[PDB]
Structure 1
Amino acid sequence: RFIQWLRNWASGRDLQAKLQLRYQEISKRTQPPPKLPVGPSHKLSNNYYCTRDGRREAMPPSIVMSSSEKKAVSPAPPIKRWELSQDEPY
C-alpha cells in the first residue's frame, strides 16, 4: 500500500522488527511439568561428611612481625598489553 513505502523511504526499511511483540511469534505458553536433577554428590555410600569440608579453614598466616641479595621482587609480574580486536578498531 501507499502508506507502507513512505515508511520504507524514511530511515531505511525494516518491516519486520516492530516495536511490539504483541503479534504472532511471541512465545505464548509452555506445557510440561518440570522436574529438577539432583546432581552434586547428593547420593550415598561415598558422598559423606569429613570429605566435603566446605567450612573450617584456618587463620590468616602471620608473616614476620615485631615482638640479603634479594632481587626486589614485585608483587606480581606486570600487566602485558592488549590486542586491538580485529573487527573495526577505527
Structure 2
Amino acid sequence: ASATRFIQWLRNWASGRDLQAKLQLRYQEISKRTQPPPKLPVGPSHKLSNNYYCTRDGRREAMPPSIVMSSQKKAVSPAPPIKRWELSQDEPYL
C-alpha cells in the first residue's frame, strides 16, 4: 500500500496490470478478529410433537440387496446413453 507513486507506475508497467487494485497483501478489508456471538439455527427435527423417530429413521429404511438372479425381449443397457455435452457459451475457446 505504501509504495511511492513512481514505484507504482514502474511495477504496473512492467507487469502490464493495475496491481494496486488487487494487492496480494491484506490490509483493513479483512474481517475483524473479534466477532459478535453467533445464534445458530436448529435442524428440522427440533420439534415438540409430530416428531417420532420411527418416521425419520434413515438407517432402518435400508434393506438388504434385491436378488435379481440366484443359482440357488428387447436388449437393455445399464442406463440410457449419455447425452453429448454442449460447448460453453461463456468462452468456448481459450
TM-score (norm 2): 0.68
The match for 1:11 is 15
TM-score (norm 1): 0.70
- Report the Cα offset of residue 17 of structure 1: 4.4
Alpha carbons of structure 1 residues 50 and 59: separation in structure 2 relative to 1, 3 Å: closer
Q: Is the CA contact (8 Å cut-off) linking 2:12 and 2:18 kept in structure 1?
A: yes
Alpha carbons of structure 1 residues 22 and 72: separation in structure 2 relative to 1, 3 Å: closer
Could you say which structure has the higher helix fraction? Answer: 2
The whole-number CA distance in structure 2 between the counterparts of 1:19 and 1:80 is 43
The whole-number CA distance in structure 1 between the counterparts of 2:35 and 2:21 is 27
SS at match of 1:64: strand
SS at match of 2:55: coil
Deviating 4+ runs (over 4 angstroms): 17-20
Alpha carbons of structure 1 residues 78 and 10: separation in structure 2 relative to 1, 3 Å: same
SS at match of 1:50: helix
Q: Is the CA contact (8 Å cut-off) linking 2:8 and 2:20 kept in structure 1?
A: no
The whole-number CA distance in structure 1 between the counterparts of 2:72 and 2:53 is 48
- Report the Cα offset of residue 33 of structure 1: 1.3
The match for 2:31 is 27
Mean CA deviation greater in 53-62 or 26-35: 53-62
Equivalenced residue count is 89
Alpha carbons of structure 1 residues 16 and 26: separation in structure 2 relative to 1, 3 Å: farther
Percent of residue pairs bearing the same amino acid type? 99
Q: Deviations over 1:2-55 (max 9, x none)?
A: 333221221213242455434222223343111221131211121112212222
